[model samples]
Target: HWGYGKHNGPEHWHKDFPIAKGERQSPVDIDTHTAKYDPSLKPLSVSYDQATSLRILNNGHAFGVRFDDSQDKAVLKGGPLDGTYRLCQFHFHWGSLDGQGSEHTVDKKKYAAELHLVHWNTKYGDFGKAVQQPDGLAVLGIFLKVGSAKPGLQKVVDVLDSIKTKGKSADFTNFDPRGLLPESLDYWTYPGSLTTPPLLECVTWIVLKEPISVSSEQVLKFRKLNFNGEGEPEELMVDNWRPAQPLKNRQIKASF
Candidate 1:
């Protein structure tokens, strides 16, 4: 397989993973201390134990879940959120090692990687239809760091052996996504364009401040996830984190 951890990284990403350019990338610097925040700005429904009907999909890049309509009832008292957003997909942004590979930066600091639980407005039906519209998505950006180990993510990892290669999939069945979110859902919100190709300026982002913990070994497995063709036979598609972008004039808010 072609190795993708160095010079062959981002450049190779677009060769086949063209969607990389318009995806709403993450690991941006969130200066938690920069301003007085309003707690109301956080998601009111991402409370403890919130459950949703789950539909997992193999979206050519990552295996993610789509939240059915039930997720809207989740109530985060006073969260600044305004709509009922359904999840569409969930995937990861990993690194070659366990130390850093996240998509959104923290005060300019990078982490191991980020896991995105992509969601969209059901108003457009499933992801098949949602992608065609503006303002049709919302993603739950959960930061993952290689730190103290935990069993919280076993739901996905237990099935790893099956989908270890490109385009492999299984029914990520009977799992409550709420059980997968970090303990804290308090987050920062913003309006931004997709970070991948198609660069659609149609997303309302809710990036959680709390990061989930995984062990260095678990992180290594993530780093090993690749989609290079079977012919390449040596592509180690590691270091998939995109370089962070300038925030420009985007407005941001946090829950107090």
Candidate 2:
């Protein structure tokens, strides 16, 4: 009952959920480099810790959730992020095939998939409205590539077996999504439109330049099952991802 429904695709989402249409969406390409930019635009630092709450929602995409708070112990004690920013939802974009499936392009290259950490400014109220205002959102993008196996990531994948139904979810209690982020904190930052509907241009994106390597088998696993409730064995619905968009006029800055 909580799926995207008839207006599921990006273009139609805004029509049904109009409370915050035109809100900026995230996961944009970060490739900016210039001397004329304000230092205030960049986050001085980012840290993922324990106080962060984690949840896995079964609203169709069946994604995870976490938050970033400057006052919370979960963030770096001296981090520069606005105390109000809070992560809302986390989801993935993967290809049906292991070879190609990421949402962001790297020097014109694609990866196995991409994971998005959706966040909104708590000062702006709920996510529906927060994403619409300028400076209302920030997102973290992690690239997933097919290759070496990652034991750390397997922890979340293990849960998929339990929440196999289209609308089923298991409480991801006591889990901290920080552990899932790649060790390298270095990332690329930029301003871009939301990959989803409304295509709102209100997001500040921080995409990690590094790719997290996962076993080809893992990528295959994500693509292997298409959970349709027909009681019949599901076939390969593996490729459920969006193609990378062209980066035009967006500035991408890197934190080395």
Q: Which ten residues in a row have the lowest lDDT in candidate 1?
A: 72-81
lDDT of 1 by residue, 135-254 (tens): 677766788876776476666666665665666666665666665577776778766655554446566667777888887766666545555534547455456566765555665687
- Candidate 2 has its poorest 10 consecutive residues by lDDT at 72-81
Please report, in order, the local distance difference test score of every candidate based on alpha carbons. 0.60, 0.59
After TM-score superposition, what is the CA distance of residue 59 in candidate 2 from its true location, in Å?
2.9
Candidate 2 lDDT by residue in tens digits, 63-174 = 4544434443343211224655665567777776766667677655667788887777667776788767766677777889777887767766777666554555666655
- The superposed Cα distance between candidate 1 and the true structure at residue 122, in angstroms, equals 3.1
Q: List candidate 1 stretches off by more than 4 Å.
A: 1-27, 33-36, 39-43, 47-60, 66-78, 125-129, 132-134
Error of 1 at 86 (Å): 1.0
Each candidate structure's count of clashing pairs = 37, 11
